[PDB]
Amino acid sequence: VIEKVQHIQLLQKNVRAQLVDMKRLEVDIDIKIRSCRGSCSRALAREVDLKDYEDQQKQLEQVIA
Amino acid sequence: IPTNLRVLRSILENLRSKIQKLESDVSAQMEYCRTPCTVSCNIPVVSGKECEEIIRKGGETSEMYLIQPDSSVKPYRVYCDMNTENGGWTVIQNRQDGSVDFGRKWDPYKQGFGNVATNTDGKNYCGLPGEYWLGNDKISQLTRMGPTELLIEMEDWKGDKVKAHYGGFTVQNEANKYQISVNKYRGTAGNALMDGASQLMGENRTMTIHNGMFFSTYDRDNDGWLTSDPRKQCSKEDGGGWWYNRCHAANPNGRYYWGGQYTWDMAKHGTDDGVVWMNWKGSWYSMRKMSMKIRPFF
Amino acid sequence: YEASILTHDSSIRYLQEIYNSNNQKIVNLKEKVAQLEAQCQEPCKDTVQIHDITGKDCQDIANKGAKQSGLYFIKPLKANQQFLVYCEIDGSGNGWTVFQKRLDGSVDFKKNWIQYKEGFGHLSPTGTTEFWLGNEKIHLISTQSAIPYALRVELEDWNGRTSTADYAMFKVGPEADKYRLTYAYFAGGDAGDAFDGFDFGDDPSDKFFTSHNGMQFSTWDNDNDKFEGNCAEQDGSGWWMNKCHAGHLNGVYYQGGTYSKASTPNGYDNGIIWATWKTRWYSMKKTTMKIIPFNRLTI
Ligand SMILES: *[C@@H]1O[C@H](CO)[C@@H](O)[C@H](O)[C@H]1NC(C)=O
Ligand SMILES: [Ca+2]
Ligand SMILES: [Ca+2]
Ligand SMILES: [Ca+2]
Numbered sequence: 001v002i003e004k005v006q007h008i009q010l011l012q013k014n015v016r017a018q019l020v021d022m023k024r025l026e027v028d029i030d031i032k033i034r035s036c037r038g039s040c041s042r043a044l045a046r047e048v049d050l051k052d053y054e055d056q057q058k059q060l061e062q063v064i065a
Numbered sequence: 066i067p068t069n070l071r072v073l074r075s076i077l078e079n080l081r082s083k084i085q086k087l088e089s090d091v092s093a094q095m096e097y098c099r100t101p102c103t104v105s106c107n108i109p110v111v112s113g114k115e116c117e118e119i120i121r122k123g124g125e126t127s128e129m130y131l132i133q134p135d136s137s138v139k140p141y142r143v144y145c146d147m148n149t150e151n152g153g154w155t156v157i158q159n160r161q162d163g164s165v166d167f168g169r170k171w172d173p174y175k176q177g178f179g180n181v182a183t184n185t186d187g188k189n190y191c192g193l194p195g196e197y198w199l200g201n202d203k204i205s206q207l208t209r210m211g212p213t214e215l216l217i218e219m220e221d222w223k224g225d226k227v228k229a230h231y232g233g234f235t236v237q238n239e240a241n242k243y244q245i246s247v248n249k250y251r252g253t254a255g256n257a258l259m260d261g262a263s264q265l266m267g268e269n270r271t272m273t274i275h276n277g278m279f280f281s282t283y284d285r286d287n288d289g290w291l292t293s294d295p296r297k298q299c300s301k302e303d304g305g306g307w308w309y310n311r312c313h314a315a316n317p318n319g320r321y322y323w324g325g326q327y328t329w330d331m332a333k334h335g336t337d338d339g340v341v342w343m344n345w346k347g348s349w350y351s352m353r354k355m356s357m358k359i360r361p362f363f
Numbered sequence: 364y365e366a367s368i369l370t371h372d373s374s375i376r377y378l379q380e381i382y383n384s385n386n387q388k389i390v391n392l393k394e395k396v397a398q399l400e401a402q403c404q405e406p407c408k409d410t411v412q413i414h415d416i417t418g419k420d421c422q423d424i425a426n427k428g429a430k431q432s433g434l435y436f437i438k439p440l441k442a443n444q445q446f447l448v449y450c451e452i453d454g455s456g457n458g459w460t461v462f463q464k465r466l467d468g469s470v471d472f473k474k475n476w477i478q479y480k481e482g483f484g485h486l487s488p489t490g491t492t493e494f495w496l497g498n499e500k501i502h503l504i505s506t507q508s509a510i511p512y513a514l515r516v517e518l519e520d521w522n523g524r525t526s527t528a529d530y531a532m533f534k535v536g537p538e539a540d541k542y543r544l545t546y547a548y549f550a551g552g553d554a555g556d557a558f559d560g561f562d563f564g565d566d567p568s569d570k571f572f573t574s575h576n577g578m579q580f581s582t583w584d585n586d587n588d589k590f591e592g593n594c595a596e597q598d599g600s601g602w603w604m605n606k607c608h609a610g611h612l613n614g615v616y617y618q619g620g621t622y623s624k625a626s627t628p629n630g631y632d633n634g635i636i637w638a639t640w641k642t643r644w645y646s647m648k649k650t651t652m653k654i655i656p657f658n659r660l661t662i
Binding site: 066067070073074077078080081084087088091092094095098101102103104105106107108109110111112122123131133136140166169173178179180183189190195197 | 365371374375377378381382384385388389392395396398399400402403404405406407408409410411413434436444445446447469474475477478481482483484485486487488491492494495496497
């Protein structure tokens, strides 16, 4: 396997990682922000888009393999 | 390699922006927190040792009350459910939205935290309950004044509701790691405290039994997980404090996931923290509402 | 469109430049998230707070240092436990302990024995809520070991005029004697002594049928009046009924102040009335009963 092909096998994990990682942080921030509702003047109304995170994960699986 | 660079580059650029959004979102909240939320709860005249007494004194409406379980401790605020099953219920734990963080250390779970009550559209009294944990010390003393029953109520995101009743409930004091005890179960939500997770068998089930357990938080391990692995603990950061065994069948103090079903890639630690009551909605589901109320036995 | 294989070595290390950069931000964002969480652990701020200074009653407290009006915890000597009360404190250093209050009709005063014994309504630091402290508490405060107590009664029409009626040696007995109300004398006040009686011209003994000194408290579920029927039940309230009243501060709150014999399905005079200051058909807009040691009512 030529060096360049091994660099990609690397980024493919790194990104599927960062994906799960963001996906988490996304939910985390959502939960934490809502929790401010009971402490601060108001809670930033929002709604997280888990779909786009799920769509890129599959968009990866397919291309990785 | 062909279309490969295309993909990865599209994602990394995509995430970059979601990071940009998230960053913005947090800054907006930091600014709103430059000021607090507020309430104005005029205190009812009538008072008693706990809700049951109050309701026997004429306190017939469900709202915040002041109770002094005993002359030692100073009177404190609590919410009284005077409507559910003949009223007289002292709410010691409540979840309905994601307003309060339940992933706190041992002290906040000792002293208590959250909002007992909030105001109801143009009213001098807080008639609605907020999200709060009354506090281990207080809960301990209450369940020890005499035989105490415990009523657990919950609701999924589809509007369904089920109760879990416990004829006898007690919580030892701090020095005894707030050990829990329950019995005389009856309900529709499934007996997760005594029996354990329904979808399990043998030791796997028995190790998700809360009855008899000690209370632990992510900064104070008292779980049924005996080992040296500084990670296999039942309560990790932002994890709520509960009566963890190995590790649970139910957790009314879990993180309040919006929507209900959640999965390992959403969970901060991969573990399934969250307002769970396995015996009903399963393993990775989080209730919309979850409350805990006590009342003298008789 | 599929470029040079030499473009690989380039862009194949470029995605890494925006990858580690991403992880970088994520690390700072998480740090910032933490600070956010630290700002969201507090409860909402309750405007209504209670003062620490305690004592036998609002006067004891006042003397101990209490300077402003608000909720306090008192505990008369013979009481089993301390209870919350609204203390009124003037610039003179007087501690009035309020036990009755009307100001908007937000609270229903048609309650039974127990409720009248234990108390209902809400206590507000700004003394802006309707309530009835409770006979047992009122009893305890007014019968402390050798301390003459006094009762003041302020009224307010729907036109800003306010009057008062003071009673020396106010007192309320135990449940055993049905919380009997007794006072030595009408210490004066332009409100007029309505507890002494009031001739309405209806009968040759109106003055005998509407006197409250000595009367026992009555509620619908516990008739202790001087009438064949049930005063408390008819007016639908709780009070020291005789047969029935000349002064009735726990009456139905009639908006506007002016009510008539056509306001009820029997023509009862059940509003907030005080015969000596207003007709039996003028329900007050505000009412307030407070007590304090007699040796304080102006020398
Ligand atoms: C208990 O859980 C382990 C995994 O943690 C699993 O391998 C085992 O089969 C389970 N026991 C049961 C219920 O069969
Ligand atoms: Ca937390
Ligand atoms: Ca352990
Ligand atoms: Ca009678």
